[PDB]
Design a protein around this nucleic acid. Structure first.
Length: 87
DNA sequence: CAAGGCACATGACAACGGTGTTCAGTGCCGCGTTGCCCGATACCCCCTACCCGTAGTTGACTGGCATCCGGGCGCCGGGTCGCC
């Protein structure tokens, strides 16, 4: 029962291709640099800090895009490795 | 014939005889309470074969696993659907 609901929760999400995934990774590194700059104790402009924060949030969104995409692969591997004592 | 003079013994007189006593001291030779001298054993030390925790492994490899019955009865009780 619950696994059916989790597979439903996976539902339909956009699968990832080479161009989409590499663009997402580019946004990820952009956001990582943005939060790096934010974490620096040096004073930064307020609007600049908000720009860095929003790109970091967009990178987080990209992260969840990758994870929600590859839930299907990880459950495939789980099927490969299940039935040996753990749930 | 009576009174006065000499022998032997005699009332006491201490001091020896000999033995068993008073202190008292110190041992004599049987029973006890603690000194040896060791010997062992508990407590520190160093490192090392192994136990246990963590870090990676670049073709790709994108939804499981189901259940499946001959009770059977019987009721309660409520939920959902039907009626209108």
């Amino acid at each position: 029962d619950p696994v059916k609901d989790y597979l439903k929760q996976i539902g339909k999400v956009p699968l990832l291709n080479a161009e989409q995934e590499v663009e997402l990774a580019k946004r990820i590194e952009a956001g990582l640099f943005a939060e790096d700059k934010l974490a620096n104790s040096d004073k930064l402009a307020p609007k600049l800090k908000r720009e860095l924060e929003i790109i970091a949030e967009d990178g987080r969104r990209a992260k969840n895009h990758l994870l929600e995409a590859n839930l299907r692969l990880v459950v495939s591997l789980a099927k490969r490795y299940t039935g040996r004592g753990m749930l």
